[PDB]
Structure formats: C-alpha cells, structure tokens
Amino acid sequence: AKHHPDLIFCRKQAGVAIGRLCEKCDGKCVICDSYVRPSTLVRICDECNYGSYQGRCVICGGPGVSDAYYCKECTIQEKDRDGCPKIVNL
Ligand SMILES: [Zn+2]
Ligand SMILES: [Zn+2]
Ligand SMILES: [Zn+2]
C-alpha cells in the first residue's frame, strides 16, 4: 500500500484487460483489502498488463486464478473511477 513513498496508484486509463487474484487473495478488494461484497470488475491499463505481472494477482503478484473486483463500498466511494488500480513502483 501507500504508506510507502515510492509506491502509488497507476491510475492510467484502463482498457479491456481484466485484473486477476491468486488463491490467497480471492474475494478481496484490490483497493481496501476487505471482503465486502464484490461490485465491479477490475480492469487494468495496457502497461500494467504487460510483462512479468501479466495474468498475475493484482494485489500480491501470485499466480491468478480468478478475476479481481472492486467491493461495493469502494464503488460507492468512487474508487473505481480513478483508473488502473494496480500499485506501481516509481
Ligand atoms: Zn473495497
Ligand atoms: Zn496501470
Ligand atoms: Zn494475491
């Protein structure tokens, strides 16, 4: 999370690529880490989808087994409207 100073939200325009979650993170919200009920499918930007992290867990980088969602509280607070929710290093 950030917290960290070199870490931040990509927030680039999301495209058609769908964020994933590993077995460990399944059900968890990409933004708040809660298990509030899933509300909207996570999409990531073309750059976050490229490379080593492709198809990997959007939260931890583990092997993706299911699609990531924003929870209902997050969609109410409009956290899905900011763009790509992946944490990046910069
Ligand atoms: Zn949430
Ligand atoms: Zn991104
Ligand atoms: Zn994970």
The C-alpha atoms of residue 12 and residue 3 are separated, in whole angstroms, by 20
Q: Tell me, what amino acid is at 54?
A: Q
Q: Is 57 annotated as a binding residue?
A: yes
Q: Give me ligand 2 centre to Cα 10, in Å.
A: 5
Q: Is 60 annotated as a binding residue?
A: yes
Distances (CA, A) of 81 to 31, 71, 85: 12, 13, 10
Resolution (A): 1.8
How far apart are alpha carbons 88 and 13 in whole angstroms? 14
Q: How far is the CA of 1 from the centre of ligand 3 (A)?
A: 13
Is the bond preceding 4 in cis, omega lying within 30 degrees of 0? no
19 vs 30: CA distance, rounded Å = 9
Query: What is the rounded CA–CA span in Å between residue 87 and residue 81?
Result: 16
Nearest to 48 by CA among 82, 8, 14, 5: 14
Query: Is residue 52 a contact partner of residue 10, using CB atoms and an 8 Å limit?
Result: no
